[PDB]
């Protein structure tokens with residue numbers, strides 16, 4: 001009945017009683033595990049549950065106000081086929097959507113999320129204004145603050161609001177003529193689209209891409225992000241003087257803008273959220289991934305390492321220094337940053353907090369474990385249970 | 401219908417059609433994934449399936465010989481409740497078991513495995529002779545060779561054969577009087593059990609544990625492995641001259657001996673197998689895990705690193721150097737070893753070969769990806785499907801419980 005979860009490092013044991021209530025169903029079956037894979041009555045049933053979650057959170061479950069709310073939403077659905085949330089409910093939902101994200105190692109700060117109600121957004125122009133205000137509040141001159149901006153929900157009888165970009169700030173990727181790619185190869189598709197929509201492209205490796213904001217039943221409009229608002233950090237190493245001369249850099253604000261927020265059967269196709277970076281995400285993944293910037297060999301060559309064979313561990317050595325550079329650079333530039341050790345350690349605390357709160361915590365082991373030095377972090381030795389709880393952040397198909 | 405598996409580095413795509421033939425159920429349900437957790441009529445069915453696999457492997461499927469074999473096993477089971485495997489079947493079975501091990505990144509070598517038939521073993525003393533011969537063959541003076549020794553199967557009318565030790569070679573763990581442990585903390589239980597059974601221990605950090613072998617319905621007997629049979633490697637660093645002075649070492653032969661072998665419904669509780677080490681297992685797991693030798697901090701301090709803050713990545717630096725020392729030490733000592741980069745690269749080839757052969761390959765992502773530099777290896781960016789295929793190696797409860 002209750003999955004036994006053990007920590008092998010310490011030997012501590014707990015039981016996940018929260019998974020037995022997973023609203024949705026995962027891809028795994030008793031026949032095979034696919035955990036490593038990246039990817040009106042029904043509405044009323046999801047709505048009732050959410051409202052119940054809300055009233056339970058303010059210790060008012062079963063009250064008259066609780067019953068009224070349940071009845072009021074059931075009435076809106078019968079009359080309009082859908083319903084609207086109250087400000088306090090959206091705030092509550094958005095927070096839970098983060099708390100329930102299984103692949104996020106930074107959930108310890110879930111409760112201090114700042115939600116911005118942008119359900120009154122009239123068009124692409126206003127949408128752009130909202131995104132700019134979000135970036136300003138979030139960046140905060142380098143002292144990053146977690147936040148999310150919720151745009152008008154999906155509704156029958158019109159299209160939805162959508163931010164074509166995968167993140168508010170992304171570097172362009174130009175298909176160089178010879179097969180190669182200058183800039184970020186992961187952004188090749190979105191870059192070519194920005195160009196198709198009348199954008200004058202650049203020729204650099206770190207060109208900040210414009211935003212392709214789509215309004216309901218309207219073609220995507222192009223908007224350029226004011227340079228003074230997109231904070232960036234020049235990369236340098238504390239002892240490798242030549243590093244700075246590599247011209248590497250990275251933006252300060254990580255902000256996913258292509259995921260769908262779901263709250264009580266309601267879907268918000270546009271709701272950009274952001275926090276702060278964990279060193280590995282930049283130094284190891286974005287900079288060292290073979291299908292990304294792939295700078296590992298270049299740096300190793302500059303470190304004068306024996307790259308003639310794998311046994312020397314030049315890749316491991318190079319990656320470490322690259323990560324050191326990112327941490328050193330971000331701290332020097334007074335920009336919020338967190339190393340994988342501190343991050344994973346805080347997540348272990350989040351697990352303890354959650355076990356006492358709900359009796360479990362949905363977590364995807366594969367994503368919680370950092371890309372480098374896995375077994376060196378406390379989460380590696382921690383067994384985890386993965387399941388889908390609502391509210392939640394979901395992946396959605398590209399608008400094109 | 402069939403699970404779509406994708407590689408995010410290259411962009412390639414395949415569909416696991418073999419998972420549909422998974423013989424047994426795992427712990428995951430559509431409600432929640434548990435892949436991160438470490439842990440008569442049916443007999444005939446499993447046996448028939450195995451015989452079909454064997455005859456299909458030698459291109460004799462549906463032949464008189466095949467049909468006769470199936471009849472034999474049915475007759476034997478109906479008469480005794482079990483059956484005798486033919487020599488060639490045991491060989492084929494053991495190989496498949498390795499082939500089907502989801503948590504093994506070294507399966508590219510599944511076909512090259514020496515098999516010792518010890519089904520004639522009648523005592524612990526004899527069980528010891530078999531083991532020593534295995535170690536000698538497998539060790540091969542440094543040029544390690546994959547091998548397995550299959551002891552008498554589980555049957556009605558008597559107890560099972562067991563090897564209480566989790567590996568043929570492991571270091572003792574002595575609980576000091578201050579909460580600390582001298583030696584391998586992971587071996588405190590097995591160490592104490594050997595002592596309780598009459599063995600007077602040493603007091604070092606690297607004491608090879610005596611073998612606790614058990615014959616059917618008999619108490620375990622102590623057996624000391626001859627030092628000349630246990631090949632060890634002294635650890636040193638190519639540049640860090642002070643590393644050698646740490647007096648650290650490790651054995652050459654990794655040999656699991658607490659697992660059960662399952663072939664066509666038959667269970668072999670004692671079937672020790674071995675291969676060779678992948679550097680990270682020793683450098684990262686055995687020496688750096690906080691619950692093992694935990695030398696990470698001492699090494700960092702010796703490296704004169706700044707252990708004050710975590711942002712300096714002192715842990716990461718020390719781990720890399722400890723791994724380099726293991727690779728350097730084994731290469732110098734002429735003892736077979738492979739780094740995580742070469743091992744993972746070879747496993748990517750295994751996936752391809754298996755995609756052509758059986759149309760898929762069960763793999764536990766969490767175990768395949770090395771304990772360090774995960775994203776730097778080719779397997780990290782590869783989707784995998786985990787499931788149970790027989791023949792297979794299975795975990796089993798400790799004989800003293």
Ligand code: HEM
Nearest residue numbers: 098101103104105106109146147273274275276277278393
């Ligand atoms: C406090 C700073 C935060 C840190 C350090 C952090 C870190 C991470 C990391 C490391 C991942 C995995 C990314 C990858 O390897 O691809 C992730 C995923 C995720 N995080 Fe957080 N996060 C933070 C804040 C937030 C906030 C404010 C939200 C939402 C309100 C959030 C929502 C998510 C979601 C939905 C995912 C899945 C994204 C995906 O798989 O594409 N995170 N986060």
Ligand code: HEM
Nearest residue numbers: 498501503504505506509546547673674675676677678793
């Ligand atoms: C040829 C050299 C070999 C290498 C480098 C290799 C490497 C590995 C590694 C790294 C693990 C995971 C250990 C851990 O993380 O705790 C593993 C597990 C395993 N290997 Fe291989 N292996 C080899 C040979 C073999 C052979 C010869 C067999 C069987 C005939 C085998 C059967 C298995 C099984 C069943 C497991 C799972 C063990 C467990 O769950 O505790 N391996 N191997």
Ligand SMILES: O=c1[nH]c2cc(Cl)ccc2o1
Nearest residue numbers: 254274275276277278281
């Ligand atoms: O390292 C990080 N921090 C992050 C914050 C968000 Cl919202 C998403 C991904 C992240 O990866």
Ligand SMILES: O=c1[nH]c2cc(Cl)ccc2o1
Nearest residue numbers: 654674675676677678681
């Ligand atoms: O690194 C390794 N090599 C191994 C060989 C066997 Cl048989 C088991 C575990 C191993 O871990």
Ligand SMILES: [Zn+2]
Nearest residue numbers: 028033428433
């Ligand atoms: Zn699963």
